[PDB]
Amino acid sequence: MKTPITEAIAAADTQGRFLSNTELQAVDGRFKRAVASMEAARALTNNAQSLIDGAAQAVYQKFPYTTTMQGSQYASTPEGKAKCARDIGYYLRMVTYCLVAGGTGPMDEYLIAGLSEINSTFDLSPSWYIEALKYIKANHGLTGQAAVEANAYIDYAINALS
Amino acid sequence: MKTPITEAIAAADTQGRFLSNTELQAVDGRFKRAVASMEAARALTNNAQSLIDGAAQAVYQKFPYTTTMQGSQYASTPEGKAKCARDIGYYLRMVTYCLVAGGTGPMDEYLIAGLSEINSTFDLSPSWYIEALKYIKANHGLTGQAAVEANAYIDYAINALS
Amino acid sequence: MKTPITEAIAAADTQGRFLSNTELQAVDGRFKRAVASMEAARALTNNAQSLIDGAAQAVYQKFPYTTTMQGSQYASTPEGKAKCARDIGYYLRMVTYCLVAGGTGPMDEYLIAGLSEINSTFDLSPSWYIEALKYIKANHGLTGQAAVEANAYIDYAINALS
Amino acid sequence: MKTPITEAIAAADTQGRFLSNTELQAVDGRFKRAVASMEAARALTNNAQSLIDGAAQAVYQKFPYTTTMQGSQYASTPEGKAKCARDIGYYLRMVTYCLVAGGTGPMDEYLIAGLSEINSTFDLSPSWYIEALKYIKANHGLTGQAAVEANAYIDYAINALS
Amino acid sequence: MKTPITEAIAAADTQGRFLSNTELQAVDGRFKRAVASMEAARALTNNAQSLIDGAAQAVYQKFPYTTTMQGSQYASTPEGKAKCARDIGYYLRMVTYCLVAGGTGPMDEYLIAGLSEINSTFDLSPSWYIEALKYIKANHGLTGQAAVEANAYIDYAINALS
Amino acid sequence: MKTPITEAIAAADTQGRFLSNTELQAVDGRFKRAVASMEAARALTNNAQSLIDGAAQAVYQKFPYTTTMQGSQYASTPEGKAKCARDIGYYLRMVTYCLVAGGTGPMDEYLIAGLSEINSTFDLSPSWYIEALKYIKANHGLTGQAAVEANAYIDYAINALS
Amino acid sequence: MLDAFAKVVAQADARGEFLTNAQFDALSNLVKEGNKRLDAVNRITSNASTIVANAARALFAEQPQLIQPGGNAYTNRRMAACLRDMEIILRYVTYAILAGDSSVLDDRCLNGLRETYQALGTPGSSVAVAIQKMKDAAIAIANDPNGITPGDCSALMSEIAGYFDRAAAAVA
Amino acid sequence: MLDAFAKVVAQADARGEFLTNAQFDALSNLVKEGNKRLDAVNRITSNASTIVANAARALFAEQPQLIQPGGNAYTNRRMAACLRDMEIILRYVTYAILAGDSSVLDDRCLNGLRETYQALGTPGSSVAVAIQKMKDAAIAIANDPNGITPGDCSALMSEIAGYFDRAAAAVA
Amino acid sequence: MLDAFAKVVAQADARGEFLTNAQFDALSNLVKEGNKRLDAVNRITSNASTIVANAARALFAEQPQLIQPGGNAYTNRRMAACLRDMEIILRYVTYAILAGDSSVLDDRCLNGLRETYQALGTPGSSVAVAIQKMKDAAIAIANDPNGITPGDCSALMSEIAGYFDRAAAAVA
Amino acid sequence: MLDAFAKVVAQADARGEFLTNAQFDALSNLVKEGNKRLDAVNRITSNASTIVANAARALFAEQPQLIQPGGNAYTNRRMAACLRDMEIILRYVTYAILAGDSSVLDDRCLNGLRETYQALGTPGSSVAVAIQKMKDAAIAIANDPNGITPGDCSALMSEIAGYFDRAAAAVA
Amino acid sequence: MLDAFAKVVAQADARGEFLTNAQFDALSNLVKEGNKRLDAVNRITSNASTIVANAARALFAEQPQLIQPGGNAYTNRRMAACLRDMEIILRYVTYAILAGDSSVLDDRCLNGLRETYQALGTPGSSVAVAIQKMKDAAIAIANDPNGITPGDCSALMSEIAGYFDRAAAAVA
Amino acid sequence: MLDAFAKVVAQADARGEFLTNAQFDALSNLVKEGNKRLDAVNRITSNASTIVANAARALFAEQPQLIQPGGNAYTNRRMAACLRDMEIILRYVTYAILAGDSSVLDDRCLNGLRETYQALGTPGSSVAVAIQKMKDAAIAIANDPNGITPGDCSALMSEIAGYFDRAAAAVA
């Protein structure tokens, strides 16, 4: 799993070297940024629901055809809406995981890998999840370097979907 | 040249990826540690001579045979002592370079690479330069995290010679 | 370009062999099927327009939001509709090319390669072109082995989009 | 074993692809040619003996020294003639196998592979078997596309021996 | 070209090593054996003709069909006999080259390489040249370690033809 | 283990070839040189002690600091002198092994491999063992081709240490 | 890899015999039934994507424990690997259909696959379910009597079913 | 590959000198200006996809000859290769921004690229246009004064522009 | 690699056009003339060995300087390399005959071959002679009117000759 | 490879849960204790060479049968391989110290190592002794209270000891 | 790989001893008997082809079930593989003869060969027969008293027989 | 790669001739002078390390600009590469001495080396100096008249000098 610490260790092991001051100043950017990171993770975890709902509605208002069109991919049935809220929750939870680990590792390994194949197989439009992520980024209520972390990883997701 | 920034960039390029928050918290350990690093580099640069002399004498007192034995490798001639002071200056200057760059890159590329072959070809004992480096580490006059940097890279050299 | 003849030649050259009876019975399935193939290609070429219009309208009726939503990807502007008719024409023309060449080569090399990256970059939904292709398959007016060829390559496209 | 069908399948599997219309027009040349192929195989199987004898005698008349020279490789002993008739039977049977399979696979895998090493180790002249194959090609009694198949595979053998 | 000296050098260069006592005891077997080798080479060179004729006749008596059968490969025409004497001369000259170089290099590079393909393409029987080489081995008139060298390389040729 | 015979065999096996006259003239340099080699090995084995003592003293007189300096690497303690005599005995015994095997194999595999890492880890100066080897070379009492062998392998060791 | 013809040829070579009239008749009949085979392959191949998709959806609807956190098909990577597996199985199945023999399916797909799923921890019984779904769907598509020259394809469909069941049994 | 610090170190080693007070001051100032740099990189990287997409759309709107039959950007394969190229250029640019030096951009991206486009027949002047678009967009995004601690970033933006212009000149 | 059909398709795609009635007629005529083509390929391929052998013998009879000590075709290794070269040329020629286009011959055989022979010192003019011999022989064999359904193959033989001459000119 | 944070994240994902306040507190405490960790790593790494050397000398003094003719550590090649092994073990140990988790040590060092030593004939019990020596030395160096801001590092040293003992038990 | 000298050297190094007078005498005697060894190798190597050929012919005459349809040595490919195997065995045998030690034969030929033949289904007992034939023939050729300086080679022939029997026992 | 004997053989084969009495005499004389050659090789090889070391020291004493900051031989990496180069040159020289021909030196060392040094910026004239030093030293060592059977080696030393000068001229 990609993290600053694992990236440093992998860097030192790839060339049969002990650790050096370089890797330690890296892990130091990690530990220092962990305060803002942790703050953002706590805040997002505390207001996860209100916001998965804000966001699901952002999607349904932006793309109304997804609440009326016939198809197992669309949210025109209770099961569809359930799947959608589920997936938005997955994205948010992944963001919190990245904030806790200090890197994109969790989102890379648990979500991004195989995303294109899934969206293509199940006829899921990226634009939907991009809209949800834009909503979350706009209404997570964070200020300062916490908002910088949250927005960093959310935008990472959006770029993965673009 | 190995530095925190170049290590981050190389990490992101090795897998065809843009930079991510990980690499930036790494470069952040770099920039933050750059204060202590820079302090140690300035101090070592300011007192380089007094200390190359402290150190050359440390070597000559520890291994007196090097000032009396016949051989172009030993410091029994003015040219020999000149070469020795030169090399000690090289080690110190390399330390300052590492402190400025925030990594072992400079010392790895300008000194460590080919060190064994040189010491073997020219009959130069590592123990001499280890003694010089021990002296410099003991009498560089630094306190706190500056001494931690200086000692980190000096000890890196010693380990390279061991 | 993948064709029965080029597949045979490549098969014989991959192992430093002359051609053999095998490859010739292959090229023989090609030449024999070329009658139905050619018929379907002629028919599709003759009724290309009426049908690109049948099909563009199939898309616009199935997904009405594409004629009203604001965005350079949607057909809510004359330029958008122009791009859409253009792309449907591209798909049909590719089908005719495959029918003429006796294989998927033309569509593989001119269209399928890079399709996912394009649809993702420009926010183009595969379902649109799948609907257009379903319309063309339903209303190309072909019967017998000509319809088998046309439908074979159209369905090939749909599977590429699924 | 090399056949039109196995060549098609191998072609589609080498690139992780499903089958396509190309491979099917190949297998179609196979199935269509299978009528002439089967006819030639039946005819050769029915008149195998009369002809292995016609052919063995063709060899013995063309190269009389093989019926008088002392050596385990020559047909100067009953066991030698037995081995020779055996081998001619092997060649004919291989031809029938190729005609049944629609390709050179059987002859490639059961005969051609290792032919040079055998002929060299046991001092067997290719010209003998070339003469036998020329006789069989001249007196198999086939007309039309059946003769084209039989002659195709026989000539394949001769080229392997040249 | 394979010789004891070149084999030694290649052995030392394959592992980035200087020469050692090993390679020199090898080159020493070479120089010491060079006396018998040179003797055999001189003798064979001096009686080359009488013997190419002894040998060509050995072939023609063993395989009389080669002096009566119609074909550009057989010695039934003056040009054929000329080609045959030529080739026997080539074999003998190659033997002398091997004796001069102290190894099989010359024969490997100038003759053996591509021998099977040639004999197969031009319908030349190895047994002919084996008979010629057996004659030369039987009537070269050498005794002692010279005969051991000559016979060593001649037998090397025969094994190449078997 | 590198020997003339094993070098020949390895040469013939590397290219899937039987042995040839080349390899045998190599093994012949071996067997012929085995007389001088064996003589030198016997002589060195017979006078091993007197000479390990001559040599240990050569080292202690050339580098007196090794008998007075404090350190587990130096011969300032009985255990140190014991280790030193041990190592000199190892070098001499290795020389005898090389003389018996007709090559550097024994010394390469039992001593040279890993020598730099050991001398560096345990702070052992090559110059010490070079001095011991120079003494042994000067006072082994051999004349003629026996001295050439002994000196060949001793000098091989010195070059390994340089 | 073998096809029907190659299979008969190999069996005859092991005995050192020419083909008998019975075998010639059998292979000739195989040839006469080639159009139906090409049809089956063309159809299943033409609907591969919808076969795999619908089969997967049905599977996860029947066994939701596979797609919940901790399940084997959780995360997009493992889901993609499952859909991929299904595509592979269906693909080698179609190969076998064209070849008239299960040799390619066995060697290049089924051989050693039960061991893989056991090592990874994937439940082979669920894979078997998936294969059954794809079987029913594929047979429906290939034996759809609309838009084709009428005739009896019952023997071919039992063979296709033979390959599918062969795979399912191989993984379960 | 070099960064600013490594660059100064190498220049000093070529002369065999310790760093002077001027150089220590310069590098210290670089450090003090690191937050702005990390901001620029974070922003451009965060909007890479929209930068490349909008730049491409604008390019093809301005030069429709690239996207019509026969054009260099016709077919999906070549379009994908163009979008890819743009992603690569922007990526190595960001690398250079983080490093404070153009060494990585040159060696790993720009070196030998004019020859490639000439051999393939791609018009390097159009690539230059694309790079200009991505430049303007990226500078707008990185210097957007909303949602960040106010300050003067004019020197950094001229450097970023320096890298972009460097690339454009390298391809044109 | 292209065949006739692929060639027309590519030319039409470069212009972004559907095929015209003229092109459909031309390709249909190519199809109607496929049996003759398969015959030519089958025959030349069936007699490849005797073509190469007789052509070589004739060459060395006409230019004995090639096979005497010091010549380029002296020793068995170089002779084998020459016979091999001839086999290769004839082989890619037959490829082109089946394909109806010289694309495969050019790229995979003729492209860069004049440079190879110049570097090695082989006289390309002698290779050209060999190719001419193989041409005459191959055309005789393919146009032999015995044992085949009578008809006019003059247009095909001029094409085959076109490929041979193309090779000869490429090496000379 | 995992670090503490990645470990908690993976455990939470297996259950499909957001982190609880307890976990956030635990990880925050890990962060607050990062300076001590970096110190330990820096020190052990700075004295790696003397740790390995002194540990080896002590080992061979305690077990002279390893360094006499016939022993496993006889000849320079095998000695070098032993010192190397010790360097490797200490290195992956330090990796684990920085990571706060034994994942990297296990997979990349300890997994399958007992089998290697059994096949080669190396006595794993002696390796265990060596690891114990390096443990005591490393803990002394890392917990040396001179020249550092005073504080309590007892919990970290028990973790380091945990990794060392883990290795020793893994080889013995 | 070891030769006699290397073998004695290794055995002496395992004990940490210089060679004793007995060993010096033994190796000196080996040297004095080197001409006979080189003769044996030269002869067997000179007649390798006829040894393998005659041995094979005799084998298949004694066991015709190997060369009839269904047999292991049926078809030219498997026959070629058998003759090849025989060449390999004889070759490594000669290697051992030159080396005075069976180390190279074991490691590079015999080690793991019984498993190979069992997996493939080749009857190792027939291979053993072949090896016996090649043994008798090779010993006859090497001990032929014609055209060589007379002497006693009985000890060498028992060693050669030792290597052959070693191989046969290894495969059977 | 060729030795003297192989050279004469190749020259004779190009003309298709047997060796003449003159050539047999020449090669026989080469053989009679083999002990001196083996001596030269043994000596130079035995003192390779001191030759390279002393030559390097002398070079850098004569041209201190090579070993000062900015010089080509500055830093340990480039120094090591220079000493290495010298070892290589001396090594292939000794190869040529043993072979009696410069073929191996040319192809495997000198061919294309002037281009390498020009690209890297190494002054080939300094390398030439080094080669001259190693030449004088090596000739002194090989022609040292102490501890060897007296005789005239003047012709051999001129050949060795020929190889050295050949290298120097090749690099300068």
Ligand SMILES: *[C@@H](C)[C@H]1/C(=C/c2[nH]c(/C=C3N=C(/C=C4\NC(=O)C(CC)=C4C)C(C)=C\3CCC(=O)O)c(CCC(=O)O)c2C)NC(=O)[C@@H]1C
């Ligand atoms: C037992 C195998 C038979 C036998 C052998 C035999 N030979 C000699 C004498 C010699 N054998 C050789 C052979 C070589 N020496 C080499 O360096 C090489 C490689 C090129 C070979 C092939 C030589 C040179 C001699 C000396 C010259 C000569 O012909 O006498 C003996 C005598 C003992 C000895 O070692 O010299 C023997 C016994 N003779 C038989 O009758 C056995 C059947």
